[PDB]
């Protein structure tokens, strides 16, 4: 569970992301595709080329969803219900892939927020992405 501390940490770091969320989302995807090629099996319909508009478009969507989870940090299961349903019933992404994206999201944030990416914030952000992942995978079976 996220502690008050975690919550402050997440709102704070995500606060700094601001208007770059979209670009950071796209970057996390690219890092994931390059480091964990098996994740590509879920995007057979995408142009995964460098600077693909599809990836750009997709990065925004993911970033928008994370931003929404931050905005509703005290009611994530409900704020993300729809997305939980989509992933469980249509996309059917194997659970292990969530951990891969989370990791690439952490890398991206680290690379962009040197001052804010403290040990404590790193820990809170990891717990946060784990919670989002848990929600998105909660209706799988």
């Amino acid at each position: 569970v996220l502690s008050p501390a975690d919550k402050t940490n997440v709102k704070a770091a995500w606060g700094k992301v601001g208007a770059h969320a979209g670009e950071y989302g796209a970057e996390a995807l690219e890092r994931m595709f390059l480091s964990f090629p098996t994740t590509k099996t879920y995007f057979p319909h995408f142009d995964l080329s460098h600077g693909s508009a599809q990836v750009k478009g997709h990065g925004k969507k993911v970033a928008d969803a994370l931003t929404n989870a931050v905005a509703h940090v005290d009611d994530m299961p409900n704020a993300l219900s729809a997305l939980s349903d989509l992933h469980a019933h249509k996309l059917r992404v194997d659970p292990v892939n969530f951990k891969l994206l989370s990791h690439c999201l952490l890398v991206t944030l680290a690379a962009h927020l040197p001052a804010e990416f403290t040990p404590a914030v790193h820990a809170s952000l990891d717990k946060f992405l784990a919670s989002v992942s848990t929600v998105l995978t909660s209706k799988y079976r």
């Binding site: 098996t38 994740t39 099996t41 194997d94 892939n97 799988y140 079976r141």
Partner: protein, 146 residues
Amino acid sequence: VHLTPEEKSAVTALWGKVNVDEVGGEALGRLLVVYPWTQRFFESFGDLSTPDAVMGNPKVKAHGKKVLGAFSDGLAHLDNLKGTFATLSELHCDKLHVDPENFRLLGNVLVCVLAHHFGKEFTPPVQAAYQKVVAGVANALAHKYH
């Protein structure tokens, strides 16, 4: 894989007692039931709405036999699972878009089916040898992913 002659014998000998037809249909059906998200690749199979519907689906049963068939043939090349599954590895990647994690899930389901079938005979040491095999096969199938 890194199977001991003794571990090789144990695998080899249990397998000789396996009805590939039945085990294959059961392994694949259990997979579709235990981990429902795996059903994403078998939309065209039909009704997978219930355990009963999956287990009874002939398209499922026949796919199971095809998969275990290939698996079966690989136990004859335990020293080169990699070269034995190269073309199958490319196909799964490039044509089927199957996440290799699925290979792992099936492996584990396969092990549960063998235990189910052989009870007593499927001892801890025999399970250990099979676990090495299923891991080896999953690794070989994932080898050409890019």
